[PDB]
Design a protein around this ligand. Structure first.
Ligand SMILES: Cc1cc2nc3c(=O)[nH]c(=O)nc-3n(C[C@H](O)[C@H](O)[C@H](O)COP(=O)(O)OP(=O)(O)OC[C@H]3O[C@@H](n4cnc5c(N)ncnc54)[C@H](O)[C@@H]3O)c2cc1C
Ligand SMILES: Cc1cc2nc3c(=O)[nH]c(=O)nc-3n(C[C@H](O)[C@H](O)[C@H](O)COP(=O)(O)OP(=O)(O)OC[C@H]3O[C@@H](n4cnc5c(N)ncnc54)[C@H](O)[C@@H]3O)c2cc1C
Lengths: 334, 333
């Protein structure tokens, strides 16, 4: 896979999404690359269920709903979402930039916007014997396709908003679902939770709390999983074909430290036009640093607007940086 | 009271958000703006239009974004000192003193300048008698309908404001005469059609392209002279009121006398949004730096930076970084 776009954006968190929106507003093509399986960054991975109060114009808005808003806002420009992939290398070849992903893919772009946040997200492991051994052979950390779980007996581990959703989404395809969580309350939206417990009572699936994963067993592939009551230590052996670990994602500075960027305390140094030390490469959001920089969504959006328009002008010299009043233009997409 | 921790010049979108954040840091604040309502350019210039590049809003009417910001600021009991313009900015020890066009004097520990492109003020025609009878028959806004109940009114202007009020006073005034210096009105198309319908029905006089020559009166307005700006033909109209709704203009004005380091009428700021004067921060269209763009979304970011740094300036016990709002109590309680 070597697709090309005018601009490639590292990170599909809130700032990356808005940057993509503006790149789209300037008439350019753009691709989002992020190891997280969906858009939203920290909002989606760490607190989708919580209200945010300091985003301009929203007296109150759920992190999950803000993401939905941003996704819908970028949609008219038909973005290319290359999620589930981490940007490993950033190289310049002639008039283009080449980025190779953790999936072996090689995308190119005329300009690059780095909205990497505090680092690349990756599934957190449970640490149970057999978990690591059977990864790829019955142990999963993401659902790439529901067919992968067709007629399968599945054990889902997790208590976050993501585990709740996948348990429900799979009732549609899995033979049997069993979900364990270390405590009674889930950190997911109340409605979704009520929907899950309803399915439990209906016998559509099985929810066990407070339970944790002791170990995964198999031969050539997963055959069983042993879970345990974290208080009484009583164990339960479940016959399963797959173990879907959805215990959240964690961040690591990662690859971006190897791109030859001017950094300061693991943050990307930028001037006021959001340009990094490398020409044609811009940044915005939690990943940048400058005097007065605050790790806030509201500032991240403003930084994205700046990065996107300067990157746009860099990728297409026929464009001025200032975009003009959106209110005086045709609705996005036309 | 007369004092607040921070005084914010301008109640536009960036001023409002800056106010919100100062509030979030537990400080008192006051907005000073000649406009009677908050909103700045969105309120004064394009309230009915959809905005598409405000983060998180696939589309939002300018007027609605303003009401969202006002509701967002509300819980921190803002002091809305609207209807007055900041004329002077002085510092006495550890206080900043601001006197307004209304003779008032306000004080604060820190100031945020969110002046946009200048102070808004109704556009004047410049006709003899216009300024003379202002407040005695000549108006630049509609306080209420009863103000024009049963009166003969000459309305001047060709935008949404002039057209809407001419239509909205038809059942209030004894007679309305609407004039505009251009042949065509430039208000919403639906409004223009309604105006033409009312005119065709004989509900009011509409004269274009006409202008105000002069306003006459004794202790109040009694007559007005208007003229066709092509044929130069004049017409004397017997009226009890002259309602001028010809739009707004902005004036850098007093801001050029505050001692701030400017650059082409714009306030120079560093990345923390501090101006050349310690204790004075700025944000929005009024500031300048490489890469600055006249966008609302960027103005909000600049306002967050100025509000938090201004707050730390007013209360040195506060850390500039406010921390996550989502991990604190909802605004207000
Ligand atoms: C619990 C919590 C509560 C918060 N509450 C608030 C609040 O109320 N208000 C507020 O303003 N802020 C809040 N924040 C901060 C806010 O979440 C961040 O400011 C915001 O997420 C930054 O957005 P971003 O797009 O810059 O980066 P992020 O959302 O962090 O997204 C960066 C993305 O880029 C990806 N990425 C990184 N490196 C690579 C690579 N090499 N290749 C590909 N992809 C990569 C990541 O996987 C990630 O998805 C909170 C944070 C937390 C943890
Ligand atoms: C999608 C989009 C569409 C846009 N469309 C338009 C458009 O159609 N037309 C347009 O003109 N702009 C447009 N803009 C620009 C936008 O309106 C401005 O960027 C924004 O209004 C700036 O906000 P502000 O708070 O900095 O200042 P402003 O909204 O200009 O507000 C400044 C306020 O401070 C007050 N003030 C100034 N000096 C003083 C003083 N000395 N004492 C007291 N009060 C004072 C003013 O009276 C005013 O109310 C658009 C922007 C975007 C992102």
């Amino acid at each position: 896979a070597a697709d090309h776009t005018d601009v490639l954006i590292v990170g599909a968190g809130p700032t990356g999404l808005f940057a993509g929106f503006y790149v789209g507003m300037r008439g350019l093509s753009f691709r989002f690359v992020d190891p997280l399986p969906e858009p939203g960054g920290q909002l989606t991975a760490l607190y989708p269920e919580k209200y945010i109060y300091d985003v301009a114009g929203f007296p109150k808005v759920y992190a999950k709903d803000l993401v939905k808003g941003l996704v819908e806002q970028v949609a008219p420009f038909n973005p290319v979402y290359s999620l589930g992939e981490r940007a490993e290398t950033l190289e310049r070849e002639g008039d283009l930039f080449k980025v190779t992903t953790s999936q072996g893919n090689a995308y190119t772009a005329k300009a690059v916007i780095i909205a990497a946040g505090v680092g690349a997200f990756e599934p957190r492991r449970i640490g149970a014997p057999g978990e690591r051994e059977f990864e790829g052979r019955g142990v999963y950390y993401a659902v790439k396709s529901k067919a992968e779980f067709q007629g399968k007996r599945v054990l889902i581990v997790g208590g976050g908003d993501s585990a709740v959703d996948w348990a429900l989404n799979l009732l549609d395809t899995a033979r049997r679902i069993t979900l364990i969580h270390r405590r009674p309350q889930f950190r997911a939206h109340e409605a979704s939770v009520k929907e899950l417990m309803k399915a439990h009572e209906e016998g559509r699936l099985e929810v066990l709390t407070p339970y944790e994963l002791r170990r995964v067993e198999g031969d050539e592939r997963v055959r069983w999983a042993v879970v345990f009551h974290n208080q009484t230590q009583e164990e339960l052996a479940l016959e399963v074909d797959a173990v879907l670990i959805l215990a959240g994602y964690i961040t690591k500075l990662g690859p971006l430290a190897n791109w030859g960027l001017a950094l300061e305390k693991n943050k990307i140094k930028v001037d006021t036009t959001m340009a990094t030390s490398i020409p044609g490469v811009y940044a915005c959001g939690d990943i940048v640093t400058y005097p007065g920089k605050l790790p806030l969504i509201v500032l991240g959006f403003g930084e994205a607007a700046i990065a996107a328009n300067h990157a746009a002008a860099y990728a297409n010299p026929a464009l001025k940086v200032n975009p003009g009043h959106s209110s005086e233009k045709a609705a996005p997409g036309t």
